[PDB]
Amino acid sequence: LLSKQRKRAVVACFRMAPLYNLPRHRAVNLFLQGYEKSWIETEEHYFEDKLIEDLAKPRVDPLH
Amino acid sequence: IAEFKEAFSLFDKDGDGTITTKELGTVMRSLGQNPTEAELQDMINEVDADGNGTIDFPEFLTMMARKM
Amino acid sequence: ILELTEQEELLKFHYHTLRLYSAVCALGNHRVAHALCSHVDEPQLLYAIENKYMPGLLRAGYYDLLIDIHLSSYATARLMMNNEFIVPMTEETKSITLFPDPGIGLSTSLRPRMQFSSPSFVSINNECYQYSPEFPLDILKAKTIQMLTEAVQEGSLHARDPVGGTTEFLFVPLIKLFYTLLIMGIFHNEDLKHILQLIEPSGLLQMKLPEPVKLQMCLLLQYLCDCQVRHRIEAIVAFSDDFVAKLQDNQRFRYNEVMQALCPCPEEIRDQLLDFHEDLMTHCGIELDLTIRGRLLSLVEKVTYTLQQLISETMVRWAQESVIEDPELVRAMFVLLHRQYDGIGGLVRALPKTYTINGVSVEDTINLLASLGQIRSLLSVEEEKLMIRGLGDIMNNKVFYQHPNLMRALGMHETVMEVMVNVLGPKMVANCCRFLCYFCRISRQNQKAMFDHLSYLLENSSVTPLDVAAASVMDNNELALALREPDLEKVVRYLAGCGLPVEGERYLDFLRFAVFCNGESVEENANVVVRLLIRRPEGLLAAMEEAIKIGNAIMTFYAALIDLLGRCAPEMHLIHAAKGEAIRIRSILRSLIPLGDLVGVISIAFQFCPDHKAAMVLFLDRVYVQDFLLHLLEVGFLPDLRAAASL
Amino acid sequence: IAILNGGNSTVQQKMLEYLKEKKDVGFFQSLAGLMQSCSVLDLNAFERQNKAEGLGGSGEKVLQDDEFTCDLFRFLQLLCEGHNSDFQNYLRTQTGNNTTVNIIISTVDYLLRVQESISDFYWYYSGKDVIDEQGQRNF
Amino acid sequence: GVEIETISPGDGRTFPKKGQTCVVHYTGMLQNGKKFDSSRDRNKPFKFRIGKQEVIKGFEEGAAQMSLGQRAKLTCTPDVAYGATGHPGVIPPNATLIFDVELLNLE
Amino acid sequence: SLYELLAALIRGNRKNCAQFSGSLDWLISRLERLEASSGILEVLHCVLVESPEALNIIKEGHIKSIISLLDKHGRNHKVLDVLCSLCVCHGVAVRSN
Ligand SMILES: [Ca+2]
Ligand SMILES: [Ca+2]
């Protein structure tokens, strides 16, 4: 009843206050670790026909 | 001051002053969550300071100051 | 030396002597480099560079010798540390203007030190001969710029004269000194801007060039690209200081203000209550598919990226106007092209090398970094007593525990691996493998990395070189579930080779960790090798007692085969009984070996002595209901209080 | 695959004269060698991955690297698109080279290791009768 | 006993005492005349403390008997010099040395 | 022509140069014949550039024979291709030599 209504409080408190609040240098280390896994792998990569069009432009071709 | 002693005495099962992982597992498996071992080891070692591993009395009180 | 031009044998023998003055002092022989500073005698090296009548080969000789005496021991130590990017986050590191609206300003990273010893002749020569000889750089770093401007702005009329006899010996060992002078941390911004006007003008790069001189220029631009990547990565950390401090509070205070004025955890604390790294993908993965997320999309728009055009114009023009042989030129020309179209992927493969550390731990990571290259340069050489002093000073260093993802990213579980595989084509292995067993214990996921060489490590059991394989499986549970059967199968093949000993007690001590690992057995590894060891040989009451008279060899080989067979027992529950065919292995451990335990339980601890009973009592406590509480009772406890005053 | 993509017909003619003037045993020996392991969905590694799921970068089993496995056989298909009467006989009898490899027979026997595999993933799951997410994604 | 030939006269009375640093510009050669060392070459005036057993004993004793501005042509004995072991690479075993030393400053 | 036939049989094959391990003391023993020195020198130069196992046989006595060839014969650059191929192997630098 009333005794376990704080058992949900203290157990979830262990994973409450430190969530990149306690470590400073392990957070900036961890921020870029998350930054390189989601925010970096973008899709500018539509160069792949401009390049192979510009490699076959003349001898022996640059692509050949 | 004393009700957190009562929650500690409910959490303490073997009478040693250091709460191990097993009592947290046996209260968690009746609380309402289904965790992994790494998250449960974190919930004892998220407030870890020196390498004792287990949560003892004074850091449990100063953590109870940091919630209620 | 100028009259050597017409003397063919006397020129070729002094060319091939200058090759010996460089092949002898190569890869850092700092005692020999202090010895050839007496036969080569520095102020004539400054002469032989400037002289415009010296012959074709002997210009290339004295350039390639100056580099391999004074310069090319420190310049290679700034090519191992080219792809690390560990960077302090002290106060001026936030002062990077991040893209001021290759001649870089700050470059606050943590690159190695240079130290130069004055080459004299004294009686403390073991203290002197440990770094390099010195020769004055401020003279040389101004001299090679006027040596360049005299070359390109005069050579543009395309003479048939020039300095080496052709134009190869004029420009090849002038760029090669210019290249390995750039890397050494000199040529400050008053000289970088002064020298970039020679290549860019925005001209050397648009000239007519032969093949093996333009190969050296490809390695010149390929440093200029990796000077901007050092600037971009130093711009991100300048941005990721306040942005993680504007998230250490704004997330956590709303994680605290809400969880002060709430008690329970329905969703308000449950929303981010997870692993710390997995929560980092939670708060930063949402910003592209609030208030803080109005800062990234300005920056990720300005971490798009000039010289990216003039590279990708020239390196395709050079392939147009020629049929280019020497296929090291072609490959080195296209890696530099493709990097201009994929600036993202090069920026991808730097972030699993970088790291950030504070200002107070600066004072100890450089002593690690200085003592790491000494390990790393020793990879290519009684060559060992520098490694053991080096490996020990890593372990006694401060920053080896507190940043064990940095030390997983510098690669030093594979550097000490490649030292070991050289030796196993003797006293080096026992200080090599002792480093790995100290390495597996400092972190859990670090042990996961070291696991991958287990398939090699088991082929190298000498008598220690198996302790690495044991302490890679030892305490953690997932890796104990991860290994297959032919990893374990080669171990019990080798025990059949021990059908003669003492090397059986160490093969088995690995097999204890593959099956028990936490306090309770693992079920799939339980059902393996006992399914193998039926088909292997290894009465036995005659062996266990006669070894007392003979003296700890077969006394403990059978006293550890028991503790193996006790762990790979199914359960102490009705998981043992009320299951399917897990009772079949319960019968094999009591019918292939009958009990006969009276040789073990009482006679051994009455004068080795306490442990062989402790191994035998576990096999009783798993495979082997109230009358037996009385028959074996008071066994051994007669000496319990008897020797109690003999502690 | 991105060259033979629509069942190109000159490219199946360049890739056949090259197998007959520069007579390669090593190509066909590699191709039977490439389908030698190549994959199989195995449940023995799945139960440990299921048993670890009770209490703990995942999915590292998946069909034993299927992305190479579809792409190897899709490449083998496109050498016979448009009904080449010679690439359906230079994959069976192989009259040029000394030792002949029978890829058509050999590509049956890979499939037989996929029939017995995904029948056995049925039998482990034949009793529970309720789909889990990681039983969909691997099936 | 080492042969100290004076070349130029300095001032003679202000001599280096025990416990001082010696600013020397020096050029050393073998007996054959081949030059194995210098200090005009590397362009740094050498410095060392008397008595601390840093420079060799022939150089030290011959630098003792000089003054400011005086230069000397020491002809050092090989047994006071590097000896039969010599030095591996530069000095052959048991060869006499000819130093041209010159003091500039002291402490 | 007997020495050039020996030098051709080894020059490309690294495995062959390993099996020319133990015979190396006898070739350098025959080095002072002063009429067949040009055969053994080009054979030995086509050995140390190939396999690192033959680099480990050469002790202090074997080098001083090659140094002594240089005093009695003088201006021969092909001796200095051997000693250039002796103090640095394929990639590694044998710091004893
Ligand atoms: Ca406990
Ligand atoms: Ca404690």
UniProtKB/Swiss-Prot annotation, chain B:
It comes from the Eukaryota. Ca(2+) 1 binds at D12, D14, D16, T18, E23. The modification N6-acetyllysine is found at K13. There is a cross-link at K13 (Glycyl lysine isopeptide (Lys-Gly) (interchain with G-Cter in ubiquitin)). The modification Phosphothreonine is found at T36. Residues 1-34, 35-68 form the EF-hand domain. It is found in: Cytoplasm, Cytoskeleton, Spindle; Cytoplasm, Cytoskeleton, Spindle pole; Cytoplasm, Cytoskeleton, Microtubule organizing center, Centrosome; Cell projection, Cilium, Flagellum. Ubiquitination results in a strongly decreased activity. There is a cross-link at K13 (Glycyl lysine isopeptide (Lys-Gly) (interchain with G-Cter in SUMO2)). Ca(2+) 2 binds at D48, D50, N52, T54, E59. This protein has four functional calcium-binding sites. The N-terminal and C-terminal lobes of CALM bind to the C-terminus of KCNQ1 in a clamp-like conformation. Binding of CALM C-terminus to KCNQ1 is calcium-independent but is essential for assembly of the structure. Binding of CALM N-terminus to KCNQ1 is calcium-dependent and regulates electrophysiological activity of the channel. The C-lobe interacts with KCNN4 channels in a calcium-independent manner, whereas the N-lobe interacts with the S4-S5 linker of KCNN4 in a calcium-dependent manner playing a role as calcium sensor and gating the channel. Belongs to the calmodulin family. It is linked to Ventricular tachycardia, catecholaminergic polymorphic, 4: An arrhythmogenic disorder characterized by stress-induced, bidirectional ventricular tachycardia that may degenerate into cardiac arrest and cause sudden death. Patients present with recurrent syncope, seizures, or sudden death after physical activity or emotional stress. CPVT4 inheritance is autosomal dominant. Calmodulin acts as part of a calcium signal transduction pathway by mediating the control of a large number of enzymes, ion channels, aquaporins and other proteins through calcium-binding. Calcium-binding is required for the activation of calmodulin. Among the enzymes to be stimulated by the calmodulin-calcium complex are a number of protein kinases, such as myosin light-chain kinases and calmodulin-dependent protein kinase type II (CaMK2), and phosphatases. Homotetramer. Interacts with MYO1C, MYO5A and RRAD. Interacts with MYO10. Interacts with CEP97, CCP110, TTN/titin and SRY. Interacts with USP6; the interaction is calcium dependent. Interacts with CDK5RAP2. Interacts with SCN5A. Interacts with RYR1. Interacts with FCHO1. Interacts with MIP in a 1:2 stoichiometry; the interaction with the cytoplasmic domains from two MIP subunits promotes MIP water channel closure. Interacts with ORAI1; this may play a role in the regulation of ORAI1-mediated calcium transport. Interacts with IQCF1. Interacts with SYT7. (Microbial infection) Interacts with Rubella virus protease/methyltransferase p150. This is Calmodulin-1. The chain holds residues 10 to 77 of 149 of the full protein.
From Swiss-Prot, chain E:
Coiled coil: none annotated. Inhibited by both FK506 and rapamycin. One of its GO terms (biological process) is negative regulation of heart rate. InterPro entries: FKBP-type_PPIase, PPIase_dom_sf, PPIase_FKBP_dom. It is found in: Cytoplasm; Sarcoplasmic reticulum. Its main location: cytoplasm. It holds the Pfam family FKBP_C. The keyword Membrane does not apply. Residues 19-107 form the PPIase FKBP-type domain. It catalyses: [protein]-peptidylproline (omega=180) = [protein]-peptidylproline (omega=0). SUPFAM superfamilies: FKBP-like (SSF54534). It comes from the Eukaryota. Detected in heart muscle (at protein level). Isoform 1 and isoform 2 are ubiquitous with highest levels in brain and thymus. Its EC number is 5.2.1.8. GO terms for cellular component: calcium channel complex; cytoplasm; membrane; sarcoplasmic reticulum membrane; Z disc. One of its GO terms (molecular function) is transmembrane transporter binding. Keywords: Cytoplasm, Isomerase, Rotamase, Sarcoplasmic reticulum. Has the potential to contribute to the immunosuppressive and toxic effects of FK506 and rapamycin. PPIases accelerate the folding of proteins. It catalyzes the cis-trans isomerization of proline imidic peptide bonds in oligopeptides. Belongs to the FKBP-type PPIase family. FKBP1 subfamily. Identified in a complex composed of RYR2, FKBP1B, PKA catalytic subunit, PRKAR2A, AKAP6, and the protein phosphatases PP2A and PP1. Interacts directly with RYR2. PANTHER family: PEPTIDYL-PROLYL CIS-TRANS ISOMERASE (PTHR10516), PEPTIDYL-PROLYL CIS-TRANS ISOMERASE FKBP1B (PTHR10516:SF429). This is Peptidyl-prolyl cis-trans isomerase FKBP1B. It comes from Homo sapiens. The gene is FKBP1B.
